[PDB]
Amino acid sequence: TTCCPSIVARSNFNVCRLPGTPEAICATYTGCIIIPGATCPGDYAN
């Protein structure tokens, strides 16, 4: 599951993913994170 730190970061992440870029590269590009569970923490609420 992906968790983003702000709405801007999530919007940038979704654009990064349009061409098919792996989530891990979009994560470091935007500040979003990938976790194995489904419950994002409060500081990555977007």
UniProtKB/Swiss-Prot annotation:
Gene Ontology CC: extracellular region
* Paired cysteines (S-S): 3-40, 4-32, 16-26
Query: Sorted alphabetically, which InterPro entries does this protein's record hold?
Result: Thionin, Thionin-like_sf
| Classification via Pfam families | Thionin
The effect of residue 22 to S is: In isoform SI
Q: Keywords in alphabetical order, please.
A: Disulfide bond, Plant defense, Secreted
Major location (coarse): secreted
What is the top-level taxon of the source organism? Eukaryota
What subcellular locations does the record give?
Answer: Secreted
Task: List, in alphabetical order, the GO biological process terms annotated in this UniProt record.
Answer: defense response
Give the miscellaneous note.
Two isoforms exists, a major form PL (shown here) and a minor form SI.
Q: Which family does it belong to?
A: Belongs to the plant thionin (TC 1.C.44) family.
Job description of the protein: The function of this hydrophobic plant seed protein is not known.
The name this protein carries in UniProt is Crambin
Biological source species: Crambe hispanica subsp. abyssinica (Abyssinian kale)
